[PDB]
Amino acid sequence: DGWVKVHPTPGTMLFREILHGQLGYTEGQGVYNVVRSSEATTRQLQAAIFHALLNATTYRDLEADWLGHVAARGLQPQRLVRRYRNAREADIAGVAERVFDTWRNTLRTTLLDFAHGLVACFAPGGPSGPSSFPKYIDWLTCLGLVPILRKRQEGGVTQGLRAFLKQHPLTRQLATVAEAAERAGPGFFELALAFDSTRVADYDRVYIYYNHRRGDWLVRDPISGQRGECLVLWPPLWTGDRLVFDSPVQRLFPEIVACHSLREHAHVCRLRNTASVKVLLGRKSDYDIIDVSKSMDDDTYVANSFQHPYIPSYAQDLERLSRLWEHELVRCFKILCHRNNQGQETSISYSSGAIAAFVAPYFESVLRAPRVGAPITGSDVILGEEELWDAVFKKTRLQTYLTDIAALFVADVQHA
Amino acid sequence: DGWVKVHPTPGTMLFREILHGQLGYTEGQGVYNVVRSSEATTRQLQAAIFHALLNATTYRDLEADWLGHVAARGLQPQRLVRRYRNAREADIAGVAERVFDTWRNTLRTTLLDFAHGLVACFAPGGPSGPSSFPKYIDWLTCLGLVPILRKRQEGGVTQGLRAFLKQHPLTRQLATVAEAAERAGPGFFELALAFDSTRVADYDRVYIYYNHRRGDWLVRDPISGQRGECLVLWPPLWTGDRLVFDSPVQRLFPEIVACHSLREHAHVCRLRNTASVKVLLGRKSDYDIIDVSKSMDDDTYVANSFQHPYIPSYAQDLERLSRLWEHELVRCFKILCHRNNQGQETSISYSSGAIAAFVAPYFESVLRAPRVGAPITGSDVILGEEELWDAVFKKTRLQTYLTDIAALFVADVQHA
């Protein structure tokens, strides 16, 4: 009843195998390896965790803990000035600044350690297991669909968070960490459940049906019998007894098949020339390969014979196809390449537009994540994780409180 | 009865299948992938939302909030000067300046967070669902027409806006944000209704009819029976025996068809040369392939034979066609190319004229949106969301109010 089977057809499997280089290979197709890297999602996740944790802190606990530290040292400004008993303002100011700098540095190191402790829990899930990003990207590169299956249940990531959080000494040792972690905990649990709940269907098991009249998508898991929820990023076109997707492989397909056929023909012609001497026979009127044409002669005579050992040339086509693959992928997925003065490709990375267009829908639709704050810029992908923590620390809330309390402490030290 | 059937004709479908590389592909055609992108539209939406939110604020509530912050700290000028009891006006001025700087930075980050909160509601609707932008662009690239369908109803975007606004706490926390959100809300709801109401018809379901004498357009949805409206951007020409559009595919159409025919002929000629030795027979006067001319000789003799194994070459034509595609699209859609010292195509973007010519009609005619403020320039498309927010933030009302308040506060502190 107007239903069509879309995915399990042989053409789709041929697309997928074309991606594995089952008919030819090129230098251009090698760029794809970077398009599947999971680095950007992990960087975004690190940025999200850092933003969530640092945003929780507040001025009250920071001031309370600084006061507790100065009381523990017994280094209150009154006592310090009473000990020194001289009015050299520069020396006392420098001493106070260095004390506060020591405390500040140690606090930043502790916070960084805890933050890295948090991230390590989520990282393995992104590339592998439920919600694997490379599978998503190659799903898009093949069809533009992304059949997704969902169930709600606690699993690995939630258990990891539960084990990591509920015993960490750092929360007990500092009020800042205690309040920040207790406030940020619920969101992390929501995100962990989001990571655990959703899995992307496997390319060799799922079934997809499409119906033109309603434009309805039915997706089916044949093993468990579980119905899924289809997603379409680049809508296809229906043209009768057909269905034409707009994925890159479909656009490139009519070209690579012709190139492959040319290569097969050139292979066939080469074997023909292996024998270097040929003989032609006929009927009288009345290494080495010989052509017995006697069987057709009757009241006929041989008029002429010709030789032309043709061998098709195909290197030009391979160069053209390599450049075509490279340009197609680079322009389609918004890849950005850095270059030397004349040398090419020092590194390859997602552009800002690339992360915005591809990573964002992953988190929002595929994962159904709570929130990720402002997205990271393309330049922050190249940064290391430590540098990412540093950079997010520079602009975010905590540094303002630190500078304010430091300046006030120095002023009160001098004026006390 | 004097009407013409336009769209579902075979040539119209052949145009779109050409767009999917159903006859050849090239490096030039790959540039089209950047034309479809929805980046500029989302940048425009972000700019519009940021303009709307900041403009709503007012000075009196901001001054009241600053005074409330100072009172909560208890750090009023009189108390502070009485506390320090020295005439070093520069030091106290710096202390006050740093206090205000802390408050200003906190306000900046808070408003940025809320603004990003608002934007997320609209963004997903642009690229997919009703009023999808790439569908509009490919409609234009194929014909220059854009059939539209309309119903007034409240859908996903309005529900998201309703849920987000009534729950948000910043309205309670800050009076300025409360008033700004209350003022900007109605415009957001009208814009959300604009997003939800309109729909761009699918290229494989809609019918289009044209009447030369009257000069009016009829667009029909056959499955629903609904009647739509047609937007004609580059009007066609009725030459009596046809209807000729002026879309880029129409202009490039003869060239690509000629090149495809040349490639097919060159393919056919190649298979003809696979056999290297040929034999030609004749009739008595009373790997290998045999040409039997027995049955056609009588009262005749053979006089001469010629061999010339021609093989057309087509690489030059493919190069010409790639360059033609690239230049045509670049000049038609006002795309802008960035380049290294000598290297080409570091990135591709939309020129200011491109957004003015294409994005503006989308919003105003296709979407019937209320207002978008002044348009962004082509440079701001490259910038990230943070940078765009900063750029709009710097040059608007809030900064004048903040700097006035800071100047007055510091001056009064030091004069007291």
Numbering used by the authors:
A (entry chain d), B (entry chain e): 24 to 27, 29 to 310, 494 to 623
Verbatim from the authors:
Three capsid types have been recognized from the nuclei of herpesvirus-infected cells: empty A-capsids, scaffolding-containing B-capsids, and DNA-filled C-capsids. A unique portal vertex exists at a 12th I5 vertex through which the genome is translocated during assembly. Here, portal proteins assemble into a dodecameric basket-like structure that is thought to seed the assembly of scaffolding proteins, in turn driving the formation of spherical procapsids composed of MCP, SCP, and triplexes. A separate protein complex, the terminase, associates with the dodecameric portal and initiates genome packaging and the concurrent autoproteolytic cleavage of the scaffold.
To improve the resolution of the portal baskets, we carried out separate sub-particle reconstructions and refined them while imposing C12 symmetry, leading to portal basket structures at resolutions of 3.6, 3.5, and 3.7 Å for the A-, B-, and C-capsids, respectively. Additionally, an “anchoring” segment of the scaffold protein is resolved interacting with the portal baskets of A- and B-capsids but not D- and C-capsids. The C12 reconstruction of both A- and B-capsid portal baskets revealed a small hook-like density with large aromatic side chains and sharp turns wedged into a hydrophobic pocket between the crown domains of each portal monomer. This density is weaker in A-capsids, but still conspicuous, whereas it is completely absent in C-capsids, D-capsids, and mature virions. Indeed, we found the scaffolding protein residues 449–455 (PYYPGEA, numbered relative to pUL26) to be a good fit for the small density. Based on our model, P452 interacts with the essential residues W127 and L131 (both adjacent to W90) from the first portal monomer, whereas Y451 forms a hydrophobic interface with Y83 and Y608 from the second portal monomer. Furthermore, E454 from the scaffolding appears to stabilize Y608 via hydrogen bonding, buttressing the hydrophobic interactions between the three aromatic residues. Our A-capsid portal reconstructions still contain scaffolding hook densities, although with weaker density than in B-capsids, suggesting low occupancy, but even residual presence of the scaffolding protein suggests that these capsids were likely never fully packaged with genome, as full genome content in the capsid lumen should displace the portal-bound scaffold. A- and B-capsids varied in portal height by ~2 and ~1 nm, respectively, could rotate up to 13 degrees relative to the capsid shell, and exhibited up to 1 nm of portal basket “sway,” due to flexibility between the clip and nearby wing and stem domains. Our analyses of portal basket variability revealed that non-mature A- and B-capsid portals permit more rotational flexibility than mature-state C-capsid portals, which may be important for the dynamic process of genome packaging, during which torque is applied to the genome substrate.
